[PDB]
Design a protein around this ligand. Structure first.
Ligand SMILES: CC(=O)Nc1ccc(CP(=O)([O-])O[C@@H](C)c2ccccc2)cc1
Lengths: 217, 219
């Protein structure tokens, strides 16, 4: 059980960004919202809390007052606004709901913020078609190449989430072009290639791109 | 001032079934207000322990938390493959809330040779002007692997990038993709594309290749 957080956002340096966090159900119980920051591949850093009940807030001094937390008691939504953004603010921001008796009980999925002057670019999705060159025994590997997008992230599912086993979605790689690219592959029975359809569902929210690419042998 | 949380070890590689313990020492008295969380590769964070030894109701019994004076520990009675993750302790006795540097828990397992697959560029991408040739090394262990590209027997350099997954939650293996990027022109002027893979699980390098002429299959 997790909380709901706003989607990934691309914001320019010197600008500001405001993300949200709220419980799924209208569970209107007095909770505290803790915010945590995590830079790609690094550790966790407490940002601050907002107690919607009385508007109470407290910030990690390390943020130099750049973080402002607010809330809408009506919707039980908490907001974290970060100002005068720089690349150092590019990171995943998490919110956790908790109380004295139930500390850090629930965690949100996190909101990925990318501070960059570069414009967003939707990815092109190409099939990685199964063939004798990707078939060993009765197992065939296939996939999708999600190429040339910015910023992160892209989400890839297979067969609308029906296919999860044997799926390996690789970490994105930053190309010399400044655009990301990644491949999502999955191994399936070679005997299914003629009867089972394989579709990778790619979504790149920053560019409002949603592509469903059928991968044929 | 701020309470410093020293987490050790920073990296912990352990055999499956091994009893493992992570330690967090507070630079100050936190009176048992220690929290443990697990973060999986996909970024998902979940509570494991709070109040130093209280186990989250959704966490398996193999997890336990204990306190020894200023030393706080997270113990996994018997390591399972799905325990591969980053673990962090978190002090909440006072503000600011501070975390330990975390522990990357790696799983030791038997050697596993990779299955190697190669994918020619799609015609769709070719119409774009660029060609991506993908070589896949699937489910191998350990992580150490060497992938080389040869185009018409000539070793390539500088035109490939690789990405590797974190250990699999089910079999503790890694998978790696090596992508060779060429212009359409360059791709069309050459014929044999080969991916040479070297790995501890392989006695001799494994070369997977295709002839652009044959498309990427058996024409
Ligand atoms: C008066 C009042 O509301 N008090 C109060 C509320 C909550 C808590 C628990 P807490 O929020 O400090 O619990 C910790 C483990 C935490 C820190 C940062 C992110 C996630 C979890 C402790 C005290």
């Amino acid at each position: 059980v997790q909380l709901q957080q706003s989607g990934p956002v691309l914001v320019k340096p010197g600008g500001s960004v405001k993300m949200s966090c709220k419980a799924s159900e209208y569970t209107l119980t007095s909770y505290l919202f803790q915010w945590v920051k995590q830079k790609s591949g690094q550790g966790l850093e407490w940002i601050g809390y907002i107690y919607p009940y009385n508007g109470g807030t407290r910030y990690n001094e390390k943020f130099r007052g750049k973080a402002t937390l607010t809330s809408d008691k009506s919707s039980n939504t908490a907001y974290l606004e970060l100002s005068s953004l720089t690349s150092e603010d590019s990171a995943v921001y998490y919110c956790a709901r908790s109380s004295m008796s139930d500390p850090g009980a629930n965690w949100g999925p996190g909101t990925l913020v990318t501070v960059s002057s570069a414009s967003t670019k939707g990815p092109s999705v190409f099939p990685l078609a199964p063939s004798s060159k990707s078939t060993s025994g009765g197992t065939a590997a296939l996939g999708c190449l999600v190429k040339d997008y910015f910023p992160e992230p892209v989400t890839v599912s297979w067969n609308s989430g029906a296919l999860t086993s044997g799926v390996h979605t690789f970490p994105a790689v930053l190309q010399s072009s400044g655009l990301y690219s990644l491949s999502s592959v999955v191994t399936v029975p070679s005997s299914s290639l003629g009867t089972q359809t394989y579709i990778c569902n790619v979504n790149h929210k920053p560019s409002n791109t949603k592509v469903d690419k059928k991968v044929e042998p | 001032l701020d309470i410093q949380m020293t987490q050790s070890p920073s990296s912990l590689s352990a055999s499956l079934g091994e009893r493992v313990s992570l330690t967090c020492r507070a630079s100050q008295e936190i009176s048992g207000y220690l929290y443990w969380l697990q973060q999986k590769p996909d970024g998902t964070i979940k509570r494991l322990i709070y109040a130093g030894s209280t186990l989250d109701s959704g966490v398996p019994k193999r997890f336990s938390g204990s306190r020894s004076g200023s030393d706080y520990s997270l113990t996994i009675s018997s390591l399972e493959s799905e325990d591969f993750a980053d673990y962090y302790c978190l002090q909440y006795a006072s503000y600011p809330r501070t975390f330990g540097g975390g522990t990357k828990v790696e799983i030791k397992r038997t050697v596993a040779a990779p299955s190697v697959f190669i994918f020619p560029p799609s015609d769709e991408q070719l119409k774009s002007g660029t060609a991506s040739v993908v070589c896949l090394l699937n489910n191998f262990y350990p992580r150490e692997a060497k992938v080389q590209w040869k185009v018409d027997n000539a070793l390539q350099s500088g035109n490939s990038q690789e990405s590797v997954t974190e250990q699999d939650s089910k079999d503790s293996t890694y998978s790696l993709s090596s992508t060779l990027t060429l212009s359409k022109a360059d791709y069309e002027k050459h014929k044999v594309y080969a991916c040479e893979v070297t790995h501890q699980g392989l006695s001799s390098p494994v070369t997977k290749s295709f002839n652009r002429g044959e498309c990427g299959a058996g024409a």
